[PDB]
């Protein structure tokens, strides 16, 4: 503050935006809200 | 040594001068040193003293980084004997 | 160098006042900022206000100068301040645009 | 879905709704008795609320031009005609989404 | 809100209370340290007292070639409550909240 | 160890540092330079660059 010098980094808060959702925030859904669509649930949960 | 570079905005009568500087406020300036009043009018770029704001003369002679650009250094070839045919059309160019 | 201001609007110390002595409004002394007698046993020196708008956009009540007169410096009218104390000395001449104009003609 | 789940259409108010509409406005004026009610519905046919409120002002307006502070049963007549007209040409029946 | 670009919060003075204020009051502030010092009336602008009265030149309705009919609802909005403003409290119907007057120039 | 630290702790101290870009050479010597957020400032060059 008193003489402009690099001391110290913080995270990344910008240039790059935010667009991103957390997990303090996350969806409620969950795969035991998953009722149908069980074949093509394995192919995906393998996939992501 | 330092200076700050001014833009003359109008001249006023017993040897003074107004100037606009690049920060925010204008600032009154005096005539002063070898740079005389018939060497300046308005619309000319001035040289401003560090301490007291003084008209030390010009010496920017209006330049901007555009100048710079527009300004080619660099030189073609290039004459005919390089240009393959086209009699007419190299004739034209030549008279205007 | 004065910094250039140009006086927005006067309004004036001699009466509407502006210190605390006896009276918040109106001095009746008239040369004086804030007395409306001579027996409060204060007197001052008071012309007139004056609020200046600067070319740096920021605005100030400022003092008085060393000859100007209270008939010259009004509304409308180019004056030269302090670039940190914040009192007229020289008043400048009217108008801000012969910059422009004398180009445009021909 | 899960913000907005259910839509509710709000019409216009009916033959014998537009009735009830007026009365509340006549009680928050003032007014010399007015009765004629019956016959300034069929007139104002088709008006949202907002527009019976403006029709007292209406009347509000042709009374204090005979210099009266209370609504005669004649301006009422004479205000309803009026609003009625601009109301078809302003026209809005639309519903939004 | 200075005028030197900052919003300031300050601890206040013995001599201005917040009694002698209002919002949007113009103040002076010391210059040095930011603390309310004195009071100073409302703004007031050069052409902003100019804009309060240009009536004349007059143009009034026996210059202007007809235009009914649009000068009777001109008077109904604005000139018939204007004088006849006492009623219209009595009477508890509102007044126009003003008029848009739009077209063609 | 010491002098090392100390070097450093020093070049913080120093007020800051700005950053232009020459754009004329005058004839005196000196240089039109134009710092890049503020305004240009032609100024006599430094004593060990030509």
Known sequence: RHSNALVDILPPDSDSSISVMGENEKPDVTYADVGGLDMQKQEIREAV | NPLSIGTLEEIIDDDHAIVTSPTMPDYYVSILSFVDKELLEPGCSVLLHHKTMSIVGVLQDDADPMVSVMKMDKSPTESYSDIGGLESQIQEIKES | PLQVARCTKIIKGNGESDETTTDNNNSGNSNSNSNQQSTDADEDDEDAKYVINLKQIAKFVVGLGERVSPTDIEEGMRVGVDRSKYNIELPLPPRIDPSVTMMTVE | PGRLDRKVEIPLPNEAGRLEIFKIHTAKVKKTGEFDFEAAVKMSDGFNGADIRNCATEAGFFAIRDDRDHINPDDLMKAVRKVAEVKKLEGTIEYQK | KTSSRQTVFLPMVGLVDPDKLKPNDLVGVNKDSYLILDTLPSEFDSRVKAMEVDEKPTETYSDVGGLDKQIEELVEAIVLPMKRADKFKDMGIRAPKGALMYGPP | ?50
């Open chain 6, 1 to 50: 160890k010491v002098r090392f630290i100390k070097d450093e702790l020093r070049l913080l101290q120093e007020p800051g540092s700005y950053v232009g870009e020459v754009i004329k050479i005058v004839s005196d010597k000196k240089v039109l330079v134009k710092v890049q957020p503020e305004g240009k400032y032609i100024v006599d060059v430094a004593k060990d660059i030509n």
